[PDB]
C-alpha cells in the first residue's frame, strides 16, 4: 500500500474564532539513548598470529600498524566510561530520599530504589534490565561505573528531582514541597499556578497512572528498548565478523597457521603466512574502523543524553519536542544496559472549546490589551484568560493595560472594562 | 611499560604493556600405534611400470614410513612437493597416501605438475590445480631402453583404457629422449583416522598441565583435559568458530580429549608518574589469581597494590568500580570509587530552604576548535 | 592540566604525524625499507617485486592516516559546532538552558582564545548561605485563597512574608503581591493569615 | 551560490561514485584491468596471479 502520512485536518481558522483547552492530561513519554558501548580491547599480535614466533617475526615487518590498533581500541575503550560518567555523574553529592515519602500525592515508589535487590536499582529499572541482552586474542573490558554505582547515580538525580526541584543543578539542594515545585514547573509552561492546587488530585492521578503504563509498555513490548538492543547487535555482529575472519584463506593453503607451520619449511610457509598477515591486518583495521565510526555515532548520543540530563532532569525544558511532547514539566533518569532511559512528565492540553476572540478591547475610546492570556467571548459576555487553560475572568483595569485610542486596531471591539477602585470608593 | 610508550618518563595512569601466557612445560606427541613399513619399495623398485595413459594407482595405508630416504637419494632426477616440504614429511600424517607409476618422455616431465599445459596433461594425466604432495622421477634408460616402443598416450585423476595410440621410441643411445620413471605421491589431508605416517615414535599423554602437543600431525599448545564432550563413533576432532580445533580423539586410548590454550590475559600496569615513583602495581586481566598484597578484583587479579577498606575519588581507573592511588611511608593502593559525599535533603511537606546570599562563580571551559591543517604529498611519501 | 583537551588535540596530531614518519622504516616484506638500496642493489625486473611490496605497505599505511584524520576531524567539527553555539548562546545572549553555560544560573560569559581551542570564560549566580523556613502554598483570608503573583510565601515562625524564589527577601503580603482564585476548601496545605490591603 | 551545501552533498556523492567507477580501470599490478583480456588471454592457472 502506499503509507498514509497521517489524518488529515483543515484546522477551522478564522480570522476572530481561538481554540481554548478547559482541561488538560499529564503524560509521561519515555526516551532512550544509548550511552556506552562494550569496551573491546585487543592483542593484534595473538589475533594475527596467536602463540607463533614463527609469524610474529614477520608481523614485526608491519611496525606500527599493530600497536596503533590497541591505541584506537584503548582511545574508545577508555571514551566509554567518559560517556558514562559525562551523562550519570552531573551531581556531585549522593542525595538521598527522606524515610517518609509525603509527596503531595504523586507515587514515585515505582522509579525510587527498592531495598528488596541485591544491586537497588528502582522497579522500572529491573524492567528495563530484562529487556536487553575469546582465546583468539579479543577481550571485553568492564566499565569504570557498575550498574549499582549507576543506580546510586540515577538515585541522586531523583532524590534530588524529588525533593529540590532544579536547585540542585545551581548550587547545594534547597528542599521545596512537591506541591509547590509543581506549582513553579506549571509557571514555567505558562499554567498559572492555581490551576496545579486546585486539581492536585487529578494531576496526581494522573501522573500516577501514566507512571502505571510505562510498566505495561516496558512489560508487554521488547521493542521498546529498540536503541540500546540494537548496539548490543551491533558490537556482537562486529566480534563475530572479526572472529569468522580467522577463518578465511586469503589465498594461502590454510587458515590455521599451525597446519603452514607443521607442513612447510621456513622458504615456503613465509610465503603462506604473509597472506594470512594482510588478510587479518586488513580485518582488524577493518574491525577498528568500524568501531571508530560507531563509537562516534555513540559519543555523540552520549553527548546528547548529558544535555537531555543537564536540562530536562536539572531543570525545566523550554525547547519545543526536546523533553518529551507537551509542555515540558520535569524529567526522571533511569539507567538501562548501555544507556539512559528519560520518563519526561508533560502537560498536554486537552479538551478545547470554540470562542469568539478579539486583539484588543475599546472602554470610553481608549484600546485596552490583556496583560497576561487573551480576550474571547462565550457568545454574550467577554472574559479574559490564560492561553493554555481557560479560566474566564472579568475583564478590568488589573488585568489589561492601554495604548493608544480604538482607531489603529484592526478588530477591536467594543466592551466594557471594570474599575474595582470606583465601587471601593462609592459604596 | 618504558617500551611499550618508547619513553624513559612515564606519566600517572595505567597501560596495557603485555600479555600474561602460562608456558607449555613439555611437548606430547601422538600417533596411531600401529608398525607395519609401507611398501614403498615395491613401488620404486618395481621391474615394470605403465604406460602414461593408463598409470597405476598403489594405496598405501596402516603403516609407518620414512619419507628423507627417498629425499636423500642420488636415483631421482626430481622430487618438486605442492603442499608440504620434504624435510617436513617425517613429522606429520595422512589418512591414505597413494603412488602413481608410469613411464614418460623426459621432455614431458614438467607436464607431470598441478595444473600445467600439454597433451599427456590434458588426455590421461591432469595434476588438479589444488594438489598436495610430491612428484618423484628417475631417468629409467637403464631398464626400459630395451629400442623399446611399447609406453604410450593419447578431468583430473581420470584413467583413459585414425588412432588414439601413440607410443615413444626409446634406445639407450637416445637427455630428454630417454625414457623415466615417475611416481607421484598424493596425501589424503582428511580431518579424519589417520593411518600413513612418519617413523616418529608417540610420547604418554598429559592432562591439566601446559604442553605443546602433536595429534597426527595436528601442532597445537594447550591443556588438555577429559570433557563432556560427547563424540559420535565416527568423530576424530572438534573445532571453535575460528577454525581452530578445540577437542580431539586420541590416537591410542580413543579418549575425547579438551584443549584449552594455557591460561592467558593482558597485562597492564598501573604507575605513579615515574615523576615521582618506580613503584608500580599490576592487573592480570580477566583471570583467576590462582594462574598468575594480592587482591582479585573483577576486572582480573590485582598484584602490589594494598586493598584500602576507604573510599576516595578514582584516581587511576582499573575497572568494575576499582580505583588506585599513590598514598601513606607511601605506597600504591586499591579502593572502591567514592561516587561522593552522600546528603540526605531535609524534605518536609511544609520546609523551603530559600539562599539569603549568593556567589558569583567564574568556570573557565575549554573547547577544541581547529586541529593543525596538516597536508600529506602522497607520491612524495610513497616514493621519496 | 586545565588546558587538557588542547594539549591531548596537539599530542594526538602530533603522534599521528610521527607514526606516520615511522612506518617509512618498516620493511613490509622488501629486502629493505630504504627505497635506493632496492634501486641500487636490484635490476628493474627484479626490483618490482620488492618495491610493489613497499607501495602496497605505505599505500595502506597513509589510508590509515587519512581515515582516522576523517574520523579526528570529524570529532573536532562536533567540538567547534558546540563552540560556535556557545558563542552564539553564552557570548552573545544569556543562557536558560541548565549547566549549558557553566555550573549555577547563567550570567554573561567572555571568549578568550587559545592555541588550536577557545576558552569560555563564564559567569553564573550560585545562590548561598540557605535559611529553612515554614512555608504553603496559599493563604486563606474572607474565605478567598491568595497566591503569590511573583516567588512564594514563607514564614520565619511568627509571621508570614512573600519572597523572591532565588534571593530571601521578604515582604509584608499584600493583594498587590497577591492574586485571588476561588475559596480555602479546595487546597491542600493552605493557611490563614491576613493578606494586607494598601 | 545560496544551495551551495545541497549542490555540494549532491557533488560529493557523485564525486565518489565516479572515482569507484574509474578504479575498474586501473591495472594494480595485473597485465590488464579487463578482467575477461586476463580470462581470454591466459590459461585458468597462470591467469589466478
Ligand atoms: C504507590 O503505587 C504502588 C504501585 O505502583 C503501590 O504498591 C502496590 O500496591 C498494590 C495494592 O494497591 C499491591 O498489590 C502491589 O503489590 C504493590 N506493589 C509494590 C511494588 O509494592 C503503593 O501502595 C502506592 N502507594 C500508596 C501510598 O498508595
Ligand atoms: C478533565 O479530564 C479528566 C480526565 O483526564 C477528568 O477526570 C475524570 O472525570 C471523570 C468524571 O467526569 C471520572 O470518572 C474519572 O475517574 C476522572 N479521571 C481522573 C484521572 O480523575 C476531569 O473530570 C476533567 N475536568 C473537567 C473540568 O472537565
Ligand atoms: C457567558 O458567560 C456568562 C457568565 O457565566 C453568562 O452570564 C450569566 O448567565 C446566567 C444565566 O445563564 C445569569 O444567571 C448570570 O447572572 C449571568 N451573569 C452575568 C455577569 O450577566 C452567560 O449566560 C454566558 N453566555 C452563554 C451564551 O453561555
Ligand atoms: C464602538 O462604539 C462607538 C460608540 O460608543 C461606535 O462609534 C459610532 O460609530 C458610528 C458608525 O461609524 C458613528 O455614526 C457614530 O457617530 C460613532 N459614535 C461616536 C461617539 O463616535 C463605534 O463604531 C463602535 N465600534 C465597534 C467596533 O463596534
Ligand atoms: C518574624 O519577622 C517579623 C518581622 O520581621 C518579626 O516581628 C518584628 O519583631 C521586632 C522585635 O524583634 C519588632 O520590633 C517589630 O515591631 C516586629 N514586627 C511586627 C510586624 O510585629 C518577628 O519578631 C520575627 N519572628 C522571629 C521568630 O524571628
Ligand atoms: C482558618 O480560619 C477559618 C475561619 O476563618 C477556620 O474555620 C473554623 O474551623 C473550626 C474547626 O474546623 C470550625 O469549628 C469553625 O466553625 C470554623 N469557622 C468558620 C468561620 O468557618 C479554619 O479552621 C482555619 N484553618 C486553619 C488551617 O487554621
Ligand atoms: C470549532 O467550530 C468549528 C465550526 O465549523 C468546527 O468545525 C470545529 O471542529 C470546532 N473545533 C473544536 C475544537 O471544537
Ligand atoms: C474578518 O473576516 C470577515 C470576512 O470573513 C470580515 O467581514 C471582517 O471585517 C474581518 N475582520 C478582521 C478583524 O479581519
Ligand atoms: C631399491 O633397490 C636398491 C638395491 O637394488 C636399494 O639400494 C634401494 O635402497 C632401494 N630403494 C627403495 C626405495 O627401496
Ligand atoms: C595402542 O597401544 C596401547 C599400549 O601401548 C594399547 O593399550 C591400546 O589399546 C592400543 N590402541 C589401539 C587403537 O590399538
Ligand atoms: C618532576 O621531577 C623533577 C625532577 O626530575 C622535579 O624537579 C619536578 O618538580 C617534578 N614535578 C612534579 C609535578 O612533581
Ligand atoms: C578462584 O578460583 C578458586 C578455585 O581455584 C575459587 O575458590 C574462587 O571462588 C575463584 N574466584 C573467582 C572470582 O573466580
Ligand atoms: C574491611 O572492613 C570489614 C568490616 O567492615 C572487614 O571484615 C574487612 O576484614 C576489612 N578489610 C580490610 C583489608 O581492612
Ligand atoms: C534545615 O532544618 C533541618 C531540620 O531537621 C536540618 O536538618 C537542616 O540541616 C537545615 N538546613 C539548613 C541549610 O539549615
Ligand atoms: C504535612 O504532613 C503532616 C504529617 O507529617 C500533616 O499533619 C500535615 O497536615 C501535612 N500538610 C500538608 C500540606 O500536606
Not at chain 1, 92 to 98: A, E, M, N, R, S
Not at chain 2, 65 to 78: G, H, K
Request: proline share 5%; net charge neutral; glycine share 6%.
Amino acid at each position: 500500500y502506499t503509507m498514509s502520512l497521517g489524518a488529515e485536518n483543515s484546522v477551522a481558522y478564522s480570522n476572530n474564532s481561538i481554540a481554548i483547552p478547559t482541561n488538560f492530561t499529564i503524560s509521561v513519554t519515555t526516551e532512550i539513548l544509548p550511552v556506552s558501548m562494550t569496551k573491546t580491547s585487543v592483542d593484534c599480535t595473538m589475533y594475527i598470529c596467536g602463540d607463533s614466533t614463527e609469524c610474529s617475526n614477520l608481523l614485526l615487518q608491519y611496525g606500527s600498524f599493530c600497536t596503533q590498533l590497541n591505541r584506537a581500541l584503548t582511545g574508545i575503550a577508555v571514551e566509554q566510561d567518559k560517556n558514562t560518567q559525562e551523562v550519570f555523574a552531573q551531581v556531585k553529592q549522593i542525595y538521598k530520599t527522606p524515610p517518609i515519602k509525603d509527596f503531595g500525592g504523586f507515587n514515585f515508589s515505582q522509579i525510587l530504589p527498592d531495598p528488596s535487590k541485591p544491586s537497588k536499582r528502582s522497579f522500572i529499572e529491573d524492567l528495563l534490565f530484562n529487556k536487553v541482552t575469546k582465546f583468539n586474542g579479543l577481550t571485553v573490558l568492564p566499565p569504570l561505573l557498575t550498574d549499582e554505582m549507576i543506580a546510586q547515580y540515577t538515585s541522586a538525580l531523583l532524590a534530588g528531582t524529588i525533593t529540590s526541584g532544579w536547585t540542585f543543578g545551581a548550587g547545594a539542594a534547597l528542599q521545596i514541597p512537591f506541591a509547590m515545585q509543581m506549582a513553579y514547573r506549571f509557571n514555567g509552561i505558562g499554567v498559572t499556578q492555581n490551576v496545579l492546587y486546585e486539581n492536585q488530585k487529578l494531576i496526581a492521578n494522573q501522573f500516577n497512572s501514566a507512571i502505571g503504563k510505562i510498566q505495561d509498555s516496558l512489560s508487554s513490548t521488547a521493542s521498546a528498548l529498540g536503541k540500546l538492543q540494537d548496539v548490543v547487535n551491533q558490537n556482537a555482529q562486529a566480534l563475530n565478523t572479526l572472529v569468522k575472519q580467522l577463518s578465511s584463506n586469503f589465498g594461502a593453503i590454510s587458515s590455521v597457521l599451525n597446519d603452514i607451520l607443521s607442513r612447510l619449511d621456513k622458504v615456503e610457509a613465509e610465503v603462506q603466512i604473509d597472506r594470512l598477515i594482510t588478510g587479518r591486518l586488513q580485518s582488524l583495521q577493518t574491525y577498528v574502523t568500524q568501531q571508530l565510526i560507531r563509537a562516534a555515532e555513540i559519543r555523540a548520543s552520549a553527548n546528547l543524553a548529558a544535555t537531555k540530563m543537564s536540562e530536562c532532569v536539572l531543570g525545566q525544558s523550554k525547547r519545543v519536542d526536546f523533553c518529551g511532547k507537551g509542555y515540558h514539566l520535569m524529567s526522571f533518569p533511569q539507567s538501562a544496559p548501555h544507556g539512559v532511559v528519560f520518563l519526561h512528565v508533560t502537560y498536554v492540553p486537552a479538551q478545547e472549546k470554540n470562542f469568539t476572540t478579539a486583539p484588543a478591547i475599546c472602554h470610553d475610546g481608549k484600546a485596552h490589551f490583556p496583560r497576561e492570556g487573551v480576550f474571547v467571548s462565550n457568545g454574550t459576555h467577554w472574559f479574559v484568560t490564560q492561553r493554555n487553560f481557560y479560566e474566564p475572568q472579568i475583564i478590568t483595569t488589573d488585568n489589561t493595560f492601554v495604548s493608544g485610542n480604538c482607531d489603529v486596531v484592526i478588530g477591536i471591539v467594543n466592551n466594557t472594562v471594570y474599575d474595582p477602585l470606583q465601587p471601593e470608593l462609592d459604596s | 611499560t618504558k617500551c611499550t610508550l618508547k619513553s624513559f618518563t612515564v606519566e600517572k595512569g595505567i597501560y596495557q604493556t603485555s600479555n600474561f601466557r602460562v608456558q607449555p612445560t613439555e611437548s606430547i606427541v601422538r600417533f596411531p600405534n600401529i608398525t607395519n613399513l609401507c611398501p614403498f619399495g615395491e613401488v620404486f623398485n618395481a621391474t615394470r611400470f605403465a604406460s602414461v595413459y593408463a598409470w597405476n594407482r598403489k594405496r598405501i595405508s596402516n603403516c609407518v614410513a620414512d619419507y628423507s630416504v627417498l629425499y636423500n637419494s642420488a636415483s631421482f632426477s626430481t622430487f618438486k612437493c605442492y603442499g608440504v616440504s620434504p624435510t617436513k614429511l617425517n613429522d606429520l600424517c595422512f589418512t591414505n597416501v597413494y603412488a602413481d607409476s608410469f613411464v614418460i618422455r623426459g621432455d614431458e616431465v614438467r607436464q607431470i605438475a598441478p595444473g600445467q599445459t600439454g597433451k599427456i596433461a590434458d588426455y590421461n594425466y591432469k595434476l588438479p590445480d589444488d594438489f598436495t604432495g610430491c612428484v618423484i622421477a628417475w631417468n629409467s634408460n637403464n631398464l626400459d631402453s630395451k629400442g623399446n616402443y611399447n609406453y604410450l598416450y593419447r578431468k583430473p585423476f581420470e584413467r583413459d583404457i585414425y588412432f588414439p595410440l601413440q607410443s615413444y621410441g626409446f634406445q639407450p643411445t637416445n637427455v630428454g629422449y630417454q625414457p623415466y620413471r615417475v611416481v607421484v605421491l598424493s596425501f589424503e589431508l582428511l580431518h579424519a583416522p589417520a593411518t600413513v605416517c612418519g617413523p616418529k615414535k608417540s610420547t604418554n599423554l598429559v592432562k591439566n598441565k601446559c604442553v605443546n602437543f602433536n595429534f597426527n600431525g595436528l601442532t597445537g599448545t594447550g591443556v588438555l583435559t577429559e570433557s563432556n564432550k560427547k563424540f559420535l563413533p565416527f568423530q576424530q576432532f572438534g573445532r571453535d568458530i575460528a577454525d581452530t580445533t578445540d577437542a580431539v580423539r586420541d590416537p591410542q586410548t580413543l579418549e575425547i580429549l579438551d584443549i584449552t590454550p594455557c591460561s592467558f590475559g593482558g597485562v597492564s600496569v598501573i604507575t605513579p608518574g615515574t615523576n615521582t615513583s618506580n613503584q608500580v602495581a599490576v592487573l592480570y586481566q580477566g583471570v583467576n589469581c590462582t594462574e598468575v598484597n594480592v587482591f582479585q578484583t573483577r576486572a582480573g587479579c590485582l598484584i602490589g597494590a594494598e586493598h584500602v577498606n576507604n573510599s576516595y575519588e578514582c584516581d587511576i581507573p582499573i575497572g568494575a568500580g576499582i580505583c588506585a592511588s599513590y598514598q601513606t611511608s607511601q605506597s600504591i593502593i586499591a579502593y572502591t570509587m567514592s561516587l561522593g559525599a552522600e546528603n540526605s535533603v531535609a524534605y518536609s511537606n511544609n520546609s523551603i530552604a530559600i539562599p539569603t546570599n549568593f556567589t558569583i562563580s567564574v568556570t573557565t571551559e575549554i573547547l577544541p576548535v581547529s586541529m593543525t591543517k596538516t597536508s600529506v604529498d602522497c607520491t612524495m611519501y610513497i616514493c621519496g
